[PDB]
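Lecture 7, part B: from sequences to assemblies.

Below are the input chains for today's worked example.
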Amino acid sequence: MASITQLFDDLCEALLPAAKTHLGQRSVNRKRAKRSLKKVAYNALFTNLFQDETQQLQPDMSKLPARNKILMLSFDLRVGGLGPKADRLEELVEELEAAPCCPLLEVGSVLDLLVQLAGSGPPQVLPRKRDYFLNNKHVGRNVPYSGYDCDDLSVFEMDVQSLISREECLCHSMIQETLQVMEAAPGTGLPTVGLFSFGDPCGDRFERDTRVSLFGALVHSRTYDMDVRLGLPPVPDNADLSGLAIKVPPSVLWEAALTYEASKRRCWERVGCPPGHREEPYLTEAGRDAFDKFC
Amino acid sequence: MDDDIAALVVDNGSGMCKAGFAGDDAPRAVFPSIVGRPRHQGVMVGMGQKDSYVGDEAQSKRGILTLKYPIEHGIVTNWDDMEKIWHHTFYNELRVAPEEHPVLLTEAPLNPKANREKMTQIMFETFNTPAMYVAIQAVLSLYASGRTTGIVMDSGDGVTHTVPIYEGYALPHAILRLDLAGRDLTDYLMKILTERGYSFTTTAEREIVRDIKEKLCYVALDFEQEMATAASSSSLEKSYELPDGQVITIGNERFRCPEALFQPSFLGMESCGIHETTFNSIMKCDVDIRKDLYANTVLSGGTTMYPGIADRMQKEITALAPSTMKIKIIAPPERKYSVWIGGSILASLSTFQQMWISKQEYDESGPSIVHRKCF
Amino acid sequence: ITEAALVRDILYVFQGIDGKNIKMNNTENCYKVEGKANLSRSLRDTAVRLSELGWLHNKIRRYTDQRSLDRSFGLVGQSFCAALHQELREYYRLLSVLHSQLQLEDDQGVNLGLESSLTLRRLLVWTYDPKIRLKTLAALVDHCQGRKGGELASAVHAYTKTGDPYMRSLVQHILSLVSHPVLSFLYRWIYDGELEDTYHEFFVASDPTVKTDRLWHDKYTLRKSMIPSFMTMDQSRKVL
Amino acid sequence: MATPDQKSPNVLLQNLCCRILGRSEADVAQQFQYAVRVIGSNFAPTVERDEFLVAEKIKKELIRQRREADAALFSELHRKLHSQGVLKNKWSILYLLLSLSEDPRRQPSKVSSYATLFAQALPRDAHST
Amino acid sequence: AAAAAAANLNAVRETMDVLLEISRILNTGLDMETLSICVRLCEQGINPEALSSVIKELRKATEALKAAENMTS
Amino acid sequence: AQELCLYLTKAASAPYFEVLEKWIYRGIIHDPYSEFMVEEHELRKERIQEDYNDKYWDQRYTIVQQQIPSFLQKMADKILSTGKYLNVVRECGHDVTCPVAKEIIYTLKERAYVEQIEKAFNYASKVLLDFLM
Amino acid sequence: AQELCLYLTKAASAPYFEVLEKWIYRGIIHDPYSEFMVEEHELRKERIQEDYNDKYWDQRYTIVQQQIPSFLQKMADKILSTGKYLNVVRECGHDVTCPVAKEIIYTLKERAYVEQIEKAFNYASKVLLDFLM
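Predicted structure of the full complex, as structure tokens:
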């Protein structure tokens, strides 16, 4: 058997993101990421290893047979209208469970993982084109006598409408994305940042100040906007009164709930909720604490 | 590249100490837990010979050095020499400042609290480490197995331990120690090689016999059946050519030697077999956890590298455990280095970074912190 | 002449239709802008750039029409035409999207100087990659002209050696699609002995005149010309 | 401290199967699967959400069992139930109870004939569900 | 062994089909090959709940890494 | 187009495979339009035994070459013989229930229908041989 | 400009590194454009065993000095030897699956491709040595 370290290494390698064609920094990032991902993976692997018993996850479904979880998913799929898919999934699950000689020792545990992997799989599923024979309701040897009910016809119409709408949505999205790319600010969105542009001076404070000062041209202002109308500070109103001072720069469940009993006490002063309201004794008689309060 | 000062990982195996940096897949340094001091102080003093060499350096100077092992039968016997060995490892092999790196230390199962305290004192005062932790080697191997409940079988050269662990906590009442490991099997193999007509008498010839054992011995799935096969067929017999070209023949000793794991009397050991030790450890465990311990049996250490040990263990555990008990023996291919891998794994946890004993905590609590701070 | 009229004409040329001011010049085998004086020379050059795409479109459509009617093109040829038609359908879908965008620009009436506005230059930019695609397809058609069967497969394999990764991907997809029927027929003949070679397109030939006495010697022959370039001669001999 | 909340059909079906069979869910997996399959593709757009039809049917059944006093009691109970605003799908509950109703006379030990009449109910099918 | 290999392959195929259906509904990014590798790991006794949590964490890490790669490219 | 043609082929084979099934399982032609590859000619049964010509064997059932499906052409003669045998068995007064009667489905890649036809031919041959012996 | 050149170099090496990978991993030159530093010469195989010259070893594959990449020039001889060994192994009838086959990527700062080439050379050398012994 592979070592757990080896199996986790293989898992991290397969799960490593496919490197974007950017050659250089991603290789070193990939080696470091492999180490970091291993650390993250081990943190997840041992999440419960040093977790106090108090974070006992809900015991209910974990103790359920994997078959029961699969049946639950099948019921949801049928409710989801994927009846034929639910039937096929049930058939395949029954076949997997029925296999008398599973070559895997943890095939039951594998199924349990798959239940634990429920919702963990990859998803646009191009809608299953209607096989000409599948919608061939009136192509058969033993056609049952049916009414004229076109419910399936309405479903097919909706499916075709969905297909057309999906193609239209894809067209609209492609248009919007292409315009949005085409709509970037002049000189913005270029793939070679700074090679054909004056790179944005976001990094170096000196470069940032140079840009906002226009290489030091600006004296008292800083700006990132290229369309700014340059103005100088207005003449102070007291200049004609006080003269011109040198400006010094600043130095800076319903059924569980059902088992609730309620008071039979009623009154003819109350009709809207006769669940009792505790007359609340008075003059001594409310007990020692009230007597102490009275004292 | 963020030069994250890597914590130190030191795997102290019964036979070999393995050390390296956190986030490495294997310890960077692996050397015999041996410190050699020059046999003749006089002649080689002028040639810049050190007064003592440790580990691989002791082996390289074995001709002129008297070797000492500060760890005997898995137990530290010379704390000053062990600290000197660790210092040599750090400064010459790893070439790191321990004051600059957290140090994860490993310990043997049932290490005396006073021994842990002395180790902590040496680590904090000699190496001035900013932080340290002391973990049981078998526990790290268990963490390397991705488990929080189970029994770890750590088998080095000098000592064997059985360490039950439940929900991340070792079960001390069910921990068993066996003073039978690779050294005893090596001596048995040397004996059977001498009986075979290959003379191994020197410590160099003893090491040759050890290498022969490591290369050609294997664990029979059924020791009696393999012995019968070797007696009935030379297919289990092996010839070995000595470096001088002398050919020695080894037969059932290929499987008779590891047969001592099931029948230690075959090596002349009075210890229980691996099956009996496992049974006794299971009985020493809680009945509710016994199923999981059988299901989480991890093999660790260099003495677990024997071929066929897994099948024999499976057979024996199945014959010894309740038929309803789920028994699973985990024999990682790297189980010779499982301790080091587990130490790297353990030390890599983000939540573990708070578990280190800092130098400040050592100075606050002293060597007794090992009994007071590391739980 | 309004730019929008040029856009409409360019969309027609992309549809292979002559515009009001841009007509196919059969003498130049290209769409020509009518010599009305009001076309900017820059506008004329842009029209020529688009007319290169229209010429490629017309060439592709001519090829499709020429081979769709030719029953003698055989099943492999029909499959190749079908794949080409599918790619042309994708191109036409893209063209329809572009037309809808141009219609949106015409209907909105605003000369929005935004970087997103459909300029003739912007149209050229949006069709630049499509232009490369169409150029690749046209080169494939030209190289495959007159080739059929295993010779067509060999021509496709020859186009697979292109360095352009986008061209490489396209040619790989076309090769896989064309070989699926070709490999099915070939393997079915060499494995099952069925020979539905109405046009003698497979690289294995059977002589029906050979008697059983020479069956091993004479009954089965190799159509060397029909050997796909993706098959080795030794592979072909083994299949035979 | 339980607040009424919509729980998945699987949980409800599991509890129902457990209580009906009186065994662990592991022991009713086959039955659970059969029930799940039947239940999973069944939406009633054809059921007319009209309590009056169910009440009339219940009254007729009670009369058939010679339990006119019980019929009056049932009418009063239905009035009280309408007075309480706990249930929203009363038509469904009443239909289920009537279908699951067992005649105490079937008092006695059997019921005289089963000449089902065209009387019945509405088909609701008329709407485009 | 050959029969065992074929049985393992058939089991992998069945698991992949079931996983593919669950995955398609699941919209999370788990692949078949990784599933086979995990199955080999699962055969080694890994707790399936732990495995699922690890897979989810790996998917989150993969998304973070993809965002980092998209920013760095 | 291949998928469409496959659907169409299966549909067009459905009545033809029904007729084939009727012939192979009962030796009965229920063909109002004479569409099956085998055509029945009314031979006077009285003279079929009397006339040197096997009018029962040779004239009762004839092959319609034009009605031979191209996909069944390789098996047509076996189909003819099978139906002849079934008709003989019925004329002998032995009611033959074909145990191999299965729905025949058009398939493009597999000639499974051919193998089923061969199984039926073998069944009819065995039944006829046992009857004769 | 350095970043742009690095992108361009990686792109141009992609097919070249693919050819290198094919040669080093399979001992097969699948070089349609004669871009690799090693050129194959058609040696008459009959005389490769017959001629005293190791035409299979020495003449079948030749180094194209002009085709030596400047970034690979220091490792070219090792590449030549590796490919020679792999070609011999294939010609010896031992099917060699190179377990170390990995994508070779051009990098400007790191000579990772050099280390990968060295690993492949060592693997091929080991395989060849075992084959010869």
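Note for the exam: Chain D has five helices and no strands. Keep this in mind when comparing with the next example.
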